[PDB]
Amino acid sequence: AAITPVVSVGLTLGFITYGWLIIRGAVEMPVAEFLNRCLRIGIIVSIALAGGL
Amino acid sequence: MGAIESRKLLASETPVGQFIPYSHHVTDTIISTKNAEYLSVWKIDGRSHQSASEADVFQWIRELNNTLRGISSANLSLWTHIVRRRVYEYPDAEFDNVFCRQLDEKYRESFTGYNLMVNDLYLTVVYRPVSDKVLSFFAKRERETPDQKKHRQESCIKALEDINRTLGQSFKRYGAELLSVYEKGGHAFSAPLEFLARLVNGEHIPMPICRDRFSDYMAVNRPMFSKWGEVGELRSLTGLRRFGMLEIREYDDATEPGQLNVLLESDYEFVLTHSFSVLSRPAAKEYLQRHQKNLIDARDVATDQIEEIDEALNQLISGHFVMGEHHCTLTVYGETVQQVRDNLAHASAAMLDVAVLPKPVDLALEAGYWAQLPANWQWRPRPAPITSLNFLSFSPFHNFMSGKPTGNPWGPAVTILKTVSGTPLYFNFHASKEEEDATDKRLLGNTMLIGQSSSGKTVLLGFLLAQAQKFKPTIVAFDKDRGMEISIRAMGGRYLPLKTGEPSGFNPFQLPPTHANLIFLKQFVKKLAAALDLSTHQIYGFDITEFLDNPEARTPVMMYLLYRTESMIDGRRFMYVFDEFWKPLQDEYFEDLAKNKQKTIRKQNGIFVFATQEPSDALESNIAKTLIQQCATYIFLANPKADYEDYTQGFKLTDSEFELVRGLGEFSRRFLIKQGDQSALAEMNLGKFRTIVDGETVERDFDDELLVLSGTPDNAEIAESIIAEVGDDPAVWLPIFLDRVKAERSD
Amino acid sequence: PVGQFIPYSHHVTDTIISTKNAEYLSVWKIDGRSHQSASEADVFQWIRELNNTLRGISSANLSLWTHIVRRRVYEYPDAEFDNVFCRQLDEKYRESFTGYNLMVNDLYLTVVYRPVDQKKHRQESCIKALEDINRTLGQSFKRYGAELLSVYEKGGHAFSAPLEFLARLVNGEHIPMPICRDRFSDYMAVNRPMFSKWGEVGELRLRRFGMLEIREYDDATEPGQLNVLLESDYEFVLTHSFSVLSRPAAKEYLQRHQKNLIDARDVATDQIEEIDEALNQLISGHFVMGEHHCTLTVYGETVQQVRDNLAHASAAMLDVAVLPKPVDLALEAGYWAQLPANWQWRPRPAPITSLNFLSFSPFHNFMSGKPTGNPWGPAVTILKTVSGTPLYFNFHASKRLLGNTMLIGQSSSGKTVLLGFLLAQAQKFKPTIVAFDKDRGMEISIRAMGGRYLPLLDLSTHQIYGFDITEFLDNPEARTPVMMYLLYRTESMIDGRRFMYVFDEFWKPLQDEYFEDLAKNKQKTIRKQNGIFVFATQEPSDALESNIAKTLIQQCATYIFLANPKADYEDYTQGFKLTDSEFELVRGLGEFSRRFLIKQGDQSALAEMNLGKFRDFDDELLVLSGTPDNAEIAESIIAEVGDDPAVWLPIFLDRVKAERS
Amino acid sequence: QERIEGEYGASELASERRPHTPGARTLLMVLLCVIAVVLVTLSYKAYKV
Amino acid sequence: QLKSYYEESRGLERDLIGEFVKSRKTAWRVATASGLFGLLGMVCGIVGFS
Amino acid sequence: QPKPVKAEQLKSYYEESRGLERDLIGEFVKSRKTAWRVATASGLFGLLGMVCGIVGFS
Amino acid sequence: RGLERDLIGEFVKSRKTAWRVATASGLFGLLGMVCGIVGFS
Amino acid sequence: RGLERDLIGEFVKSRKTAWRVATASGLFGLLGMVCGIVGFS
Amino acid sequence: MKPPQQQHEAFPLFKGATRLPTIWGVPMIPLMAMVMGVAVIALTVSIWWWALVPPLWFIMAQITKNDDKAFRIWWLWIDTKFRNRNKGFWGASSYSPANYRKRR
């Protein structure tokens, strides 16, 4: 499924942009959010892949 | 290559004109704009804030909002501008007296390490012909015949001129002054353009009216903005100035009056800014409906939710405030990039202290800096709608009293006094329009010191009369208890120490024989009947101490002395002074002559500097009433005993200010100046201090001049002895008088 | 290297330098008329006549640059006498100058005429057109006193005067250059400037220089507006150009400007009507427009000093309603735009009416004379002036130039002191002085200067002689004999030697029938023989009483006017060719003001010879002037001590001090 | 031929630098390490399928 | 006459020597372009044989 | 950068100078004329070569 | 020297340009003739 | 004088002959050029 | 010191400030910019690309909710400090005071 590189590029670019906020100084959720939301989305995508197989 | 590149780099630049929206003066008070948006500038002498009850600033905001809500057309706008600045215009004064020169050198030495900065408020009420941006999107493209361009021209000029009249009438207690064209040397110099140029340049460059658009030639300083930062740099002839902007973006559940007062007391020279793009009632009601909808789409908070927005919307419909788009950009000026960042952090701490969370502007530094010039909405970073009451609470036109350093009728300000607030007051006799009956006049210059003596009243009056010699003014001093003898001798003028038992020394025997002089001498001998050269020196003195117990002799003595001084006033700077005025003035003869000759003298640079020890004893009589009401610059002093009636009824002093005066210490040096409506609890002080010279803290004390200026019959009775032994010259006998002072100072 | 900006190629005729692109050029050295001597009434008339003579030769070919170059003059050299008294006088008078301005102004106008067997005839047509333009301009500038810069042979090496000014523009220091077979662009520069690449300031090979661009459109208030710069503590070269526009081009520019001002969103009826008035003022007012950029290039030593100079100039020009715009990146273009015929490098010219060009550069300067280059070495002495500009006095003002000088004023009011001072400090020339005196005015001064003053016999023994005829003054029997004898014997000595006369009062010998014709003929003979008469008179009414005195007065070079309140109106007004305003300035001086108005040529200034502290001048004037008691003390000493000049002078000082007590 | 002494040259503002919060680099690197190992295993299955 | 303020200003702003240098340089550039075009054509023909 | 010019002949120097200036201007305009003439001739042979090259391209 | 030198150098530069163009045209015309007379048989 | 006259003689002779050879060789080039390069075309 | 302070009498300030006109919680102007960009992508490469809408639209909603007026600051920077040509030469972005409009 080419949707696998597709999700790869989209999710990685989104993560890079979302973590660019700390440099951009527009987000006040440094520690709890950047681990929690990242782990939630990561677990969601991992479950999606391990289900797709 | 290495030759042609100058022109190649030259022609490829964006001039500052693209960012400055101004053009020809159309009216002497109103400036055009390339988009045809006429505006006017309002210099304001903000009324004092320290000396008022908390509820009364609420009342001031109420009156101010009430006047605004009448004229706040949907087409208006406001740019307040409190340009804190340091005083470079205060020339050092030449002198002749040695005692005065020493006193002034010591005094200016006492100012090493003091905030010498003066607030300067402003207001530019702008008028766009059209409000809605959507139709203006077309209007920027259409073509209009010149006659209808003229029609828009007079419509806008008349509308803005009505706005100016209304604001002037609404700023009666704010000392406002509309800035307008003034001519220098057969050429037109704009008064507003200097202020807007100060906004652009950072300096005060006198802007003439040449034959171009102002946008072309109104910037004489090449600005430079950092690629990634908040600070910039202005490359000028007189030196670089680095500026770091700042921005407000988070309000709170409050609009406490004058919450931005803390930036008045600043140690950093800056330029605050505001904007209030007044907004239509339907649009404002829609914004408030949006807030209501967002809030009500949630859990039912008990009171913040419901009733507050109930009353908000009900007021807005019932016409009690007018919403508008607002943005505030404090920009601190400094000399080095580290220092401007330090000042920026200080200003951020100050704003956070009053619960308005600021965030330094970083990406839109240039947009903000071009958003300060009035008539620039397209460059504002963060316009956020607020209640109008709230905007007038972000700019109540509060200000510490500072006075006018230069431009006075006589010239530079007479003295500079310490203020308990911290901001220095530039004292000067000539206040602005106390009588308030006619505009064309000579500024009223009287002064009335009142307060129980030994609290420095003689010290104060000696200090002013000692520093006022930069004007070379004539002085005639009617004193009491021989206090001023030492000073008047030190200022190198005749002092006559009138006393009983010794021959008078002056008599009318040799008077000129003209028919007017015959009239006077006939009048005198008709008043006496009851039951050398005077042109030599400049600063005279006469003692009338023994005449307080004399009913009969006061009229002849004052009659003769005043007549002799009357011929003196031919235009030269003349400064009558007095002491315990009413008893010399408690005479039925010359009250009418005094009022008439007062109106006459006030024209050719005349001044009365009154005084008093017991203000209760003075206000009772008829004569003192006109003179209390005819003094512009009050100077109140402290007293352990005070009465509401006299201070409020007679002296036009408010209740808060009266309680302030009562709260003063018994002998603490603190006197409430009251030039006009403005007030300031100043204090000239003569305490111990340190001097920054050669790394040496040279202990300097003012007592060597206190024992001269301070009134003491004992000290005067030995000063007279030492002058009798050696009466050569005050410049000569001053060291030996100080010597004999040191001889008695331990016996 | 640098020739990429300099357009000059070679000469085409003695007075017209060519250009690389065939743009023939000429240079004029304009002294300028004094703007203090004449009131505000005549300044407008000056501007109007300059406008008339400009629009007379108006054409699209023409152009004009104008430069006001200020110098710290060093070409005025110190001179060593051969007498101790004169050396003392010179040394103290020079020490009276520590801290003064010591700056001269020079004004240069250049006319460039660029055209827009036929070829040879067109070359001839171009040069003939430019020479006719020069003739008209010379007719115009008669009052101003300009001279046409032309080649001058120096010992077989032909030179070229115009190259010197164009050199000073770029070199910044007067470096003489010869005319040679190259194109002058290659070597006209010697000290090439080095502009910082950012362009705020510059360099020279020593002196840093920053610029200002004076872009003004409003009609000037004064006919000379920014003349406050003529007196300042910094050097500069203030430059204006007038690249004329052909009349249709001016009309088109005004029309386009009015259109672009109309087609705007804001109406300003203070501008449109004024411009529309000017548009048909142009046709009927008869003034022709043109391009104009103004640039001020102040020099300095330290770069911060240059910025202080710029701030001072900006303030002193905001005082006159003009706003200076500092130059930041255009400095290279501005500086290379100073050279005449560098139209290309002008930063941002904008059209200016002819009245406003002639009213921005009207050729006003405080009169200052020639520091050096005179036919008799340097200037004799350097008089001060009101408003602080050094007048370099000299008797030779515009076939050697005329030198006869007259000193009209009261003898008591500093006439004798002035004459003694001038002769003592002009002793540097070592000329023979034949002094004549009235009431023993100069006996002590001459005897101090090593003469043989004969109080009342061949001239080889001494250089100076003085003959006193105050005894024989008003005795009509034999003034004519004694004067013939003295004049004849002195005239026999007149060959080769640099020569001079001094007449304290001449109108008595003037009414001589036989002597006057001989004097006039000998004058005609001597004018080319280094002859310098120095006439004087106690009061002009004494002179003009005699008719021949007017004839002799017409032949005079420099007039010095002391303070004489009791001055007849007719005498100064039409007798001496003075102005009414100058007559006012003469009376303005007090009874003993110690100032005097020197009408030198056709310009004048108040040379205030002030003997302040810093005084030895009190002692010098005490020994300079002559009184009968002074004369008897001097005679007694000279009789007893001997002959040598400096042996007795201390004894004289002691005796005079005892007299003063 | 050198910049002319004691004049205003280029700005002193170009010296400015954007400070880095001294935790962003290390944890950002470790976060990319783990996300990259996930993504590589994911493309391992992508090609294998 | 010229009757164009732009025309007169640009006439002043222009020098003969540089204009003619540019003119001859452009003429030689065009001549070189035409010569190279001719060489291209001849190459095309000599290929066109075989 | 040589020494001054011979002063014995002022007239000869700037006489030949004006002559040289006129001759230089004339020769430079004539060179421009020949430059465009050669450009036209080069264009003509260029297009002759191109036309024959195309027509012979079978 | 100077302006006269510029004139002389200018016309000799023109002369060697003429020699260059004449040489190129002579060689290229002889080339055209030779390719033609290569075709003609 | 002599040097200028020699330079002018070189001008006339060499430059005029350079362009005369340019014209004659160009004309011969044109003749042969048209001829052969039309021949094989 | 203590200039006038509050005692709960302060004039109410409601938080309808910078509650910009938003659809779905996003302002009109930037969302229209995204619509134009995604439409360009869809018309350019492939038509399956209106799935690029929800990701960036959600990220824009999260950006706007946190800091309501980020896009105005973005556009101001882009228009002014990004266009200015000679940023490198001066060491900072500068505008010449004298109006050199390329005229003569």
Residue numbers in the entry:
A (entry chain J): 30 to 82
B (entry chain A): 1 to 531, 607 to 822
C (entry chain B): 15 to 130, 147 to 235, 240 to 432, 441 to 498, 607 to 764, 775 to 821
D (entry chain H): 21 to 69
E (entry chain E): 13 to 62
F (entry chain D): 5 to 62
G (entry chain F), H (entry chain G): 22 to 62
I (entry chain C): 1 to 104
Quote the study's own text.
The recent cryo-electron microscopy (cryo-EM) structure of the conjugative Type 4 Secretion System (T4SS) encoded by the plasmid R388 revealed that the remaining VirB proteins form a large assembly organised into four sub-complexes: the outer membrane core complex (OMCC), the stalk, the arches and the inner membrane complex (IMC). Previously, we solved the cryo-electron microscopy (cryo-EM) structure of a conjugative T4SS. In this article, based on additional data, we present a more complete T4SS cryo-EM structure than that published earlier.
We now define an “extended IMC protomer” containing not only the same set of proteins but also three additional polypeptides: the fourth TrwG/VirB8tail mentioned above, the TM region (α1 and α2) of TrwI/VirB6 (residues 30–82), and a newly discovered density, corresponding to TrwE/VirB10 (residues 21 to 69) (in green in Fig. 5A). In these regions of VirB10, the density was of sufficiently high resolution to build side chains. As can be seen, the VirB10IM-binding site on VirB6 encompasses entirely the VirB2-binding site, and therefore, VirB10IM in this conformation would prevent VirB2 subunits from being recruited to the VirB6 assembly platform. Therefore, we propose that the regulation of pilus biogenesis is controlled at least in part by the interaction between VirB10IM and the TM region of VirB6. The structure of the T4SS we have solved, therefore, represents an early, inhibited, assembly state preceding pilus biogenesis.
